[PDB]
Design a protein around this motif. Structure first.
Motif, PDB file in Angstrom:
ATOM      1  N   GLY A  42       0.797  -1.226   0.000  1.00  0.00           N
ATOM      2  CA  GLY A  42       0.000   0.000   0.000  1.00  0.00           C
ATOM      3  C   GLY A  42       0.830   1.277   0.000  1.00  0.00           C
ATOM      4  N   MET A  43       1.907   1.287   0.778  1.00  0.00           N
ATOM      5  CA  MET A  43       2.729   2.484   0.957  1.00  0.00           C
ATOM      6  C   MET A  43       3.494   2.800  -0.328  1.00  0.00           C
ATOM      7  N   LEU A  44       3.632   1.800  -1.205  1.00  0.00           N
ATOM      8  CA  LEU A  44       4.270   2.026  -2.497  1.00  0.00           C
ATOM      9  C   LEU A  44       3.310   2.642  -3.509  1.00  0.00           C
ATOM     10  N   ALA A  45       2.020   2.358  -3.362  1.00  0.00           N
ATOM     11  CA  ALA A  45       1.059   2.642  -4.417  1.00  0.00           C
ATOM     12  C   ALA A  45       0.306   3.940  -4.232  1.00  0.00           C
ATOM     13  N   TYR A  74      -6.291   6.242   1.909  1.00  0.00           N
ATOM     14  CA  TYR A  74      -5.148   7.077   1.529  1.00  0.00           C
ATOM     15  C   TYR A  74      -5.382   8.548   1.917  1.00  0.00           C
ATOM     16  N   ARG A  75      -4.367   9.386   1.705  1.00  0.00           N
ATOM     17  CA  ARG A  75      -4.468  10.826   1.945  1.00  0.00           C
ATOM     18  C   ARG A  75      -5.652  11.439   1.188  1.00  0.00           C
ATOM     19  N   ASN A  76      -6.517  12.111   1.950  1.00  0.00           N
ATOM     20  CA  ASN A  76      -7.765  12.744   1.479  1.00  0.00           C
ATOM     21  C   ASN A  76      -8.793  11.775   0.856  1.00  0.00           C
ATOM     22  N   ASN A  92      -8.859   3.833  -9.606  1.00  0.00           N
ATOM     23  CA  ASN A  92      -8.319   2.827 -10.487  1.00  0.00           C
ATOM     24  C   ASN A  92      -6.811   2.989 -10.675  1.00  0.00           C
ATOM     25  N   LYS A  93      -6.316   4.233 -10.706  1.00  0.00           N
ATOM     26  CA  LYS A  93      -4.866   4.430 -10.865  1.00  0.00           C
ATOM     27  C   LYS A  93      -4.151   3.875  -9.635  1.00  0.00           C
ATOM     28  N   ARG A  94      -4.745   4.099  -8.457  1.00  0.00           N
ATOM     29  CA  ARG A  94      -4.196   3.585  -7.199  1.00  0.00           C
ATOM     30  C   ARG A  94      -4.172   2.047  -7.176  1.00  0.00           C
ATOM     31  N   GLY A  99      -1.671  -3.342  -7.582  1.00  0.00           N
ATOM     32  CA  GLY A  99      -1.534  -4.670  -8.175  1.00  0.00           C
ATOM     33  C   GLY A  99      -0.116  -4.995  -8.634  1.00  0.00           C
ATOM     34  N   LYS A 100       0.529  -4.017  -9.274  1.00  0.00           N
ATOM     35  CA  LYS A 100       1.935  -4.173  -9.681  1.00  0.00           C
ATOM     36  C   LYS A 100       2.879  -4.304  -8.509  1.00  0.00           C
ATOM     37  N   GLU A 101       2.712  -3.457  -7.495  1.00  0.00           N
ATOM     38  CA  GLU A 101       3.546  -3.569  -6.301  1.00  0.00           C
ATOM     39  C   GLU A 101       3.294  -4.902  -5.559  1.00  0.00           C
ATOM     40  N   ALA A 102       2.054  -5.402  -5.566  1.00  0.00           N
ATOM     41  CA  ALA A 102       1.800  -6.670  -4.878  1.00  0.00           C
ATOM     42  C   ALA A 102       2.519  -7.817  -5.566  1.00  0.00           C
TER      43      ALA A 102
END
Ligand SMILES: O=c1ccn([C@@H]2O[C@H](COP(=O)(O)OP(=O)(O)OP(=O)(O)O)[C@@H](O)[C@H]2O)c(=O)[nH]1
Length: 384
Positions: A42-45, A74-76, A92-94, A99-102
């Motif tokens: 999460g912290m990467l995305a 996430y923030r806001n 969706n961008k998040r 998904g890529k970071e996972a």
């Protein structure tokens, strides 16, 4: 020679099944480490990533194999913005980056599902647990906490009852969301309503939420004070005794839903047996309150991100239609989620009713009528 002992053995077997299903001592550490892993992804995305578990690993009505439900904020983040096209696009961008970071961090079978409500599914690369990540599932987190509080009253009593209901539900395809029958949460809620009717759980008749919904503090407050019958105090150290109480409840559960009139009644933990048409009224009121706050938040976003303006009435209308189609009072079953008045039973198709009713008939018949013929491996026989 008057020596039948089926009921005794069935109770013994079912309490053993319960005991065998319980997470080991270190399971809370395992799940905590899973939360941290997912937070790392999460912290990467996304910025100011925050990860909350929900579902059975939070309620405690779980096995070590139970899947994991995860809520990403996430923030806001605002719970009120989901439905707004531009924000849905951003979410969706998040989730795309999540998904890529996972995958990078070593999660298996990662599947990003692109939609207005995006989700990422994967198999944890440490435990093999199936995980479901969505943005800001606030209802999910909240109802899981209430369920946790319910279980806390007497964990092995509520625990065994719910476990056996689910085990039966799954074997018999009463719990089979992909086959258009119930999900686990919906049957859990159903089973708890029977306990309420028996005086074995309080009725949550005083929701104080801003939108009229039941809050965690509403629930915790009532449960803190709730007393089981005095006999329950002698059931904490003997599974033969406790199993008699759980067995009685299972009988009542089976009989309750083999006979329950769903043409008139709904399932609710706030008001058991509340009429479909009264649920309709409650829903309509809820949707007015929700719509007011929703529009207000949509405006607040646009004020801060003018290029996403002006407010799109068509999109806002579609979002409200989605809130409405989540809360129908005319579906085959109406099972009310106490944190948001969603009809969690709404997806069960009319053509599935026969199977559900027949399985409740069979369960009632076996637990009550054919008690002398009870065989655990028969009652919980996997369907087909
Ligand atoms: O219709 C639904 C389904 C699910 N949920 C929310 O999602 C969570 C998980 O939904 P599940 O049906 O998976 O519940 P569960 O974790 O108790 O079932 P098992 O996996 O143990 O079989 C629930 O705890 C609830 O918060 C809903 O709010 N509504």
């Amino acid at each position: 020679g008057h020596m039948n002992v089926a009921k005794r053995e069935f109770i013994r077997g079912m309490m053993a099944h319960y005991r065998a299903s319980l997470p080991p001592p270190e399971h809370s550490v395992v799940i905590h480490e899973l939360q941290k892993r997912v937070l790392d992804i999460g912290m990467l995305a996304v910025n100011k990533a925050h990860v909350e578990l929900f579902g059975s690993h939070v309620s405690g009505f779980c096995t070590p194999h139970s899947d994991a439900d995860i809520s990403l904020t996430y923030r806001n983040f605002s719970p009120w913005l989901q439905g707004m096209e531009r924000v849905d696009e951003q979410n969706n961008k998040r989730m795309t980056r999540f998904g890529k970071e996972a995958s990078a961090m070593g999660m298996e079978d990662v599947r990003y599902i692109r939609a207005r409500i995006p989700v990422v599914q994967f198999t944890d690369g440490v435990t093999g647990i199936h995980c479901d990540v969505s943005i800001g599932n606030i209802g999910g987190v909240e109802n899981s906490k209430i369920l946790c509080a319910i279980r806390q009253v007497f964990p092995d009593f509520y625990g065994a009852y719910i476990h056996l209901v689910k085990a039966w539900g799954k074997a018999r395809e009463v719990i089979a969301p992909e086959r258009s029958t119930f999900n686990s949460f919906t049957v859990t809620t159903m089973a708890l309503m029977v306990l309420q009717e028996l005086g074995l759980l309080p009725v949550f008749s005083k929701p104080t939420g801003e939108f009229g919904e039941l809050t965690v503090a509403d629930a915790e407050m009532l449960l803190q004070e709730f007393k089981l019958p005095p006999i329950y105090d002698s059931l904490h150290d003997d599974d033969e005794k406790l199993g008699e109480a759980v067995f009685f409840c299972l009988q009542r559960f089976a009989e309750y839903y083999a006979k329950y009139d769903f043409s008139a009644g709904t399932v609710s933990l706030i008001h058991p047996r509340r009429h479909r048409t009264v649920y309709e009224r409650v829903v309509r009121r809820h949707l007015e309150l929700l719509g007011s706050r929703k529009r207000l938040e949509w405006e607040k976003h646009i004020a801060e991100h003018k290029e996403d303006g002006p407010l799109d009435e068509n999109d806002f209308s579609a979002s409200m239609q989605n809130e409405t189609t989540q809360r129908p009072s005319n579906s085959p079953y109406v099972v009310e989620d106490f944190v948001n008045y969603v009809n969690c039973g709404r997806r069960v198709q009319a053509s599935r009713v026969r199977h559900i009713q027949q399985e409740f008939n069979r369960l009632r018949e076996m637990l009550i009528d054919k008690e002398s013929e009870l065989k655990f491996d028969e009652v919980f026989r996997e369907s087909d």
